[PDB]
Each structure stands twice: as C-alpha cells, then as structure tokens.
Amino acid sequence: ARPCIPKSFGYSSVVCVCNATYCDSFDPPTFPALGTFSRYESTRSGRRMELSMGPIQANHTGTGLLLTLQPEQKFQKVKGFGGAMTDAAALNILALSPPAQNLLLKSYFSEEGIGYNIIRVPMASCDFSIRTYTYADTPDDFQLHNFSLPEEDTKLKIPLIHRALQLAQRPVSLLASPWTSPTWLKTNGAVNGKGSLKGQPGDIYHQTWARYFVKFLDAYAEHKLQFWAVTAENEPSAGLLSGYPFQCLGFTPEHQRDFIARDLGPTLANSTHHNVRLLMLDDQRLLLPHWAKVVLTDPEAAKYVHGIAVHWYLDPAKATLGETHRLFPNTMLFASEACVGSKFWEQSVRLGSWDRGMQYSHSIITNLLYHVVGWTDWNLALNPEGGPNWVRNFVDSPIIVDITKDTFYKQPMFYHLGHFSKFIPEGSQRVGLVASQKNDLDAVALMHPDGSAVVVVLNRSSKDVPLTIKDPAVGFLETISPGYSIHTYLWHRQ
Template identity: 40%
Template sequence: MPTHRRRLPILFTLIFVFTRFENALSADCTEKSFKTGTVCVCAIDYCDEIPALDVTMGQAALYTSSHSGARLHRDVVYATDSEPFGTLHLTIDSSKTYQTIQGFGSTFSDASGANLKSLPDKLADTILRQYFSDSGLNLQFGRVPIASNDFSTRVYSYNEIVDDFEMQNFNLTKEDLQWKIPYIQAAQKHNPNVKLFAAPWSAPGWLKSTKQMDGPGTLLGKAGDTYHKAYAKYFVRFLEEYSKNNLSFWGLSTQNQPTLGADKKNKVQSMAFTAETQRDFIKLDLGPALKASDVGKDLKVLIMDDNRGNLPKWADTVLKDKDAAGFVSGIAVHSYQDSEADKHLDETNKNHPDFFILGTEASEGSNSKDTAVEYGSWDRAEDYTSDILDDLNNWVVGWTERNLVLDAQGGPSWISDFADAPIISFPALAQFYKQPMFYAIAHFSHFIKPGAKRIDHSLNVIELEVESSAFLNPDGSKVIIMLNKGSLVATEHTVVVQDTADNRNHYQFKLPQRSIITLYIQTSNF
C-alpha cells in the first residue's frame, strides 16, 4: 500500500491568506436539535441544497460540516505563492495516481421504496433528487436486492413452485412493481447514468438445504447439477423481467454475505457459499448462463460481497482458477468487522490488480447493542467518513449505503433488524430528516467525479485524529477530504495544502475540531 503520511519539516512563514472560522449552522439548513445532535429538516416546500462551487483558477471552494452544526458550509480559499503558517501541512502529488474511482451509491431496498411511497410524490422526488442529481449527492450506483431481504416486510422469492427447474413460473412481485422499479426509474431521471447492480440474499426455499429462505442453509446439490443450473436461470430471469421495464444492470453479485448462511443462529434470508463453492458455481453455472443471455452477457460479476476480513483468501481461491476468473470483474466488500481493512484490501489489490474492489454495503445502528436511529449523531458521520477514507486509501473504487431512506424506527424490517439511514422519513408530517451521515457521504460523492484518480498525498506529522485523501478529477480539478475526529482530544488545526504540480500555490484554512472538510481546487477556467 502506498503511504500517505510522512514527516516533513514544518515551515512557519507567516502570510495573510483568506481563511475562515466556522462556528454556526449553515443558513440553508432548517435545523432541529436532539440530545444526540442536529438534523436538517426537509418539507415539500423547502430542503437545503449544496452551495455551488463557483470558483475559478487560483481559488478553492472549502466545504465544512461539523459536530457544532455546520452542514457543507462553503467558503472560498485563495491561493498564495508563499507558504503560510500551518499546524498541519498536506502535500498532494498528482503525478502519482492509484485506482480510478467509479462512484458512490445506495440501495433500492423494499424498506426504502415503502418509505418513499408513504410520502407525497413531490417529497419522495425531492429525496431522489437529493441523492442522484448532480446538485445533490450525485450517486452513481444503485444496489437492487433480488427478491426479499431483512429490509422487506415479508419473506418472498420470485418462484415458489417446487421443482420448477426451468423457472417457467418466475414472476416479479408487488414489491418490485410498487417499491423498487418506479423509484429506480425516477432516480434515473435525475441521473440517467446510474449503474444498477443486483444481489440475492437467498435462493427460493425449495432450492436450499433447509427448504426455507430465512435462516442458514446452502444451495442443494453441487455445482453443475440441476439445482445449480436452475438457480443460474433464476438470475437470468430476474434480469429479463427488469429489462421488460427498461432497466438494465451493470453488475451482479453472486450472493450477499455468503458467510452469514453458515451461521446457525442467523434468522434473516441468507445462503452459504464458501469461496470454493462460489468459484465452482460461477465457473460451471452462473457464468455460462449469463454469457449465453442477451441481458447478462456484458454484466460485471462480483464475488464475495462480504466483510473485508475474508480477504485476500476468498479472492485468491476464486480468481486463481482461470476458468472462474474469466467470468469475474470485481470483488464486493462490506464495511463491517474491519479492524484491519487496509491490510486485507491492500493484499487483495496486490494479488489481483486487474479486478476492482467495490464497497457494496455499509450502515450504522444495526448492531443489537446500538440504538437503531440516532437523530443527529455526529459519531456516525465520523464513522462513515473514516470508513470511506479507509476504503478509498486502500484501492476501493466506490462505496454503497445499505438503504436510501428508513422510517423513525429504522425500518420497515420483517425481522425487526432496524438500522439508521442518511434520511429518515416522517410521512404524517410530510417531512424527512437529513442525518449527519448524509452530509458525510456528500463530502465525497458530490465532489469526486466518476473517473477520478486517487493521488498521492502526505501529512507532515502523524496525527492520529486526522484522516485524509486526495483525488484528481477528469477535468483536472483536485479534491481533498479531511476528517478531524474527536475520539481522543478535540483540536482545531490550521492546514496548509501544497500541490507539487504548482509549487507557487498554497491554500490555508481551518480544520475545526470534530469536522469534515472538502477542499475543491479549480485548476483551470471554464
């Protein structure tokens, strides 16, 4: 893994440069305070927007969100050709590039669709605009569960007819027709380039060893047999039915969290694969079935779709088989149980540099010990920011939230597996709350464009409370994201950014205690 922190001498040349001290809520946020923090309230007639960049060459737009209440507060920082004072010096080098960023996303879960449908149409569309338009989060990915999962109101599959190996009775359900497809189509009106990728939580029960979707179990038989061929057809039929609704898919995961299906205590929809059985299913059944179909021949197949601690062994097992690897494009990872994520991701990229790594699921509040929905939680915004930085600094090309919108309980969920979400809906009030997590995602997704390259960056000191990353957009603009955490000692920093591509320009700004900043540097006039 390339290092992004190294020691450099601190220079103390003092020079005037535009800076800003943030200490108030962004004026555009209609704030509501709780004991746990502050949310921004949106209604039919109003919702705060991200301030426009509006900078020219030699200027940078600084966006700040903080524990004290700022939400993407914008200021302009002017370049100076002399190095000013700073307690932290960050150097970026765009001549050293790493992975290409594909984008950020969220999930069109049944729960998200149910909540959108419970709101007035105009307000539901506001949520989709906030997420998918280029004036909002500019999300590029949409994850679509194949049939039901824990964020459904019931357990269902697309074919309950036992031994229908040809999938002649395959049908989409009311959930697809009312909660998924309409809102995917509406999101595409805000961003026609949204890339959809699908993932199953379980095969129909009659194809499983336990004869039921919920709970643990494996696919019956072995790779290459009737059961595995039937399940491969199940995938193809899903793609065909969505195609009839003018929805095509960019990617497909073979199984959500396959290790969960081996947990005998697990009660949600799941199905176990080992790396070996997943490899063989792809090689003998799913891969050939997709390649033989019009809807699947160009699909990007993702393996694993599970916690990062399973790497690199899982990827090694699948991708060292050339026949299986020929059907695979990427490795899907979740953001749980990740204390050594950098090690696992770095080794995986080193072993398999031709396969991208995509973050496909992250959430807060789903641990049974946590409060599911915590209004205004800045801790969770910090967790998201730190998680995304950890991923991006270690070869991951994108990151995906678990749900677009949930209700005040953190659902609906048929099994009461409630969680937090960036947006919480209140249909009785015709309102929704934007959590700090929403703004944490925005600090990345709004500014880092698809096709951006992560670039080399370094801090002059090892500051355990500060995390950072830097990117070069296709248009030449540069993006720096920094997180100043408060887990140990809350400290404000004066940051000086120097670009090795233009040693004349330095940018000085404040990094408040417990804050997230994005510095967007414009390198040309358009």
C-alpha cells in the first residue's frame, strides 16, 4: 500500500498527487475474519479509503440510530461501475509518460485501485473531442464502403481499452453510444443543431444508420474488443432543440420506438453481434416514465430492448426510476452518464472539492435505492481546464492530468466512486436496510454473490453520528459516521 500524497488548491479538501514513480494504491484485497468487520473511511479532513477492523458484538443497548439489515428483502443485481474513454480522456492519459499512464490505469482498473468493470466508448466524435468526424463522412455512402475507424480509435481509445482490460482481474463490460450520425443521414446536414434521421423508420436512411452500428462492432471486433451493450442514441432529446451546440441526433420517443422495431433491433439480431444488449433512452430521467411507456408498450420494439439508460445532470427519483421499474420490472435501469461543473459561479474543475465528491456518492445511493443496476462516470480524465472540448463545454473529472508536470490528481470524486466500485462486484444484490429513527445519513446495503455483506454510509452533515448496524445472522457493528465522511463496511455472514 502507498498512501495519498495530499495537495491543497485552496478548496474544501485535498487531491492525491501521482506521477511517473508514485501513486497511492491498496494492498491486495483480504476478507475480515468471521465475528469482525472491515471499515474503509474517507473524510474531508483528508483520510482516503483508510482500512480499519472492529468486532461484531453479540448484544446492543441504547437510544441511538440503528440500521437493521433485511437480508430476505432482495432488490436489483448490480452490473457494475466505470467511466467514459472519450477522445479527451485518451489524449490526456497518453500525454503522460508511459509509467504515469500505467499508474493512472491501475488506479481505476486494478484490484490495487477501485476495480472499475465498465467502459463507455463513444461511437465517433462528441463534445469531448478536438474535431468533428463520424466513421462515414463520404456523402451518400449508403453501402458504407468508406466506413473506417480514425486514429482517435486505433491510436488512443482502443490501445488504452486493451491496457485497462489487461490490468483488471474482474471481467470489464464495454458500452457504446453515438452522439451523431453522418451529416448526409440527417435532415439539417450538420453534426449539431436540431435534426433527426431523414425519411421514415424502415427506409434506406434508417437501415444505413442501423448497419453503421454493425460496422462499428465489426471494426472493434477486428481489434479483439467485444461489446456488452450499445445505446440507441446519446441524449436523443438534444437533437430536438434549435441551436444545440454539439454532436446530436434527435429522436422523439415514437421515432426511437419505430427505429428500434423496424431497423436497429432486426439489424443487430441478424448480425454476428446478436448477443450485444440494446439500451434505450440514454437521457435525463425527467423523460421517464413517458419514454419507457411509448417504447416498451410496443412488443415489436420491447423484444429488442434489454434496458433503460439514464443520465445524471438534471435531477425526483420515485416518480421517474420507481414508477418505471413498477411498469417494466424485467427491464433493467442503468446510469450511463454523470458529471459536475454545471454551477454557473464555480470553475469547471475545482481541485479537491469535497462537495463534488458527496454529489457522486449521494447520486449512486439514490440510484441503488431506486432499482439502478450500474453507474457510469463521464470522462475518465480531463486537463485542469476540464478539456479538451471543441465547444468549451468544460466539466470536472475524478482524475485531472497536468501534462507539463507529468502529474495527475485524484479528486474526492475518485474516492467517493471507489467506496462503491471497489466493494460491490458484478452480481451483488441490494437488500433492505431500515433505520430506527429519522437521521441525516445516506446508506445502502448489498450482498456479494458469495453471501458477504457491504454497507456504504455517507454523512453530508458537519455533525458526527453514532450508529449501530444490526445483521441478525452475526450481531451488531458499533461505529461512528464522522461529519463529511463516507464509510464502506464489509463482513462475512458465515
């Protein structure tokens, strides 16, 4: 284990400084002995996923907050956690020296880091690109004879994805999402602005666009990368707005329904990539449950849709995620994009912001309490400006690269995400956790495939909160949630 080298940039907490020869890392994972629990702690005062162990007590008395595990109350199974390999992310990582690159990828993907098992891959360019390109920019190439991957894929994204997968012990799932089609498939003839596919679902424009998905998967497969899932479109509601400033492709819910039923569903199903899952929406949860009702009440669309992808930017959970699970319980919910830097009076990048850390962990807990099976960050890494970004739509990122110093900074967001991603493997099942009294804490409980327990407790208040966790199988965990802390608790149940 190597500890955090802390540095202040004058905000509420510290970043952890990494370079070619040093980065903070964990010892290999270990399980706590029966009758004991593991605790990982991070605090605004500067602790970073510090390991301690305590006893599970047979007895408890007190008028103090009790959280009772309900292990027979079973909810969703977890797909996983990760982030986006954008052009911006890959360019920033590959601008470091090779040893610094390896420590950055280990921080995310190694069991000595926080065990990411999802990578979202943009299909061609997005705002976090230094140019606009698609894979098929030759006008009216309906046969896609000039489809090809540019250097952004072959020299940046694909080589970094191979290295990430080599470092991970857990199987990693790839998720692909397009922002725009070629401009000659669009009513407005531009990568951005208000515009949808030309013509009507079933026609040559819609079939060419579906075949573009298959050509993408074929080209990644030639580079020995297979996808878990694709989204029908990134933020389809964006291409309905006049002057939308970056790459988009408009779909109404009806157009998405008909595209999936007539074109994308059948084209994928008849391909060698038929096992790739299709996720719908990939947009703000404020569009639910209306979007899910329009798409999934059509059986010709619903038979092709594995899940609903949601974005965390503009966020009420029960009315959107809850109602959607109730209508469509067998269609998984998955958080496919989250970020901060939206605050008009704050910088895009706030090095050492504890507030932005708490925003991530709060969002993940809310998501897990409303059926969401996975949580996917945006850019894996940005520069101190929050770029590059060709429209200056700069945002924050858990890792900030300083190319002039061959240095990268691990933000509180990195550790807040780690409290979940490191300790909740694929197949973990959320279970019940009931509080004995109204409290200011956020908490969630899950059970590992092997039967062991994990609880995360976030305290976004300034006040220390004493609490006990009861598991009827083993007894009582007596602990304290310090103000501006996050804890992960792990224990074997037999």
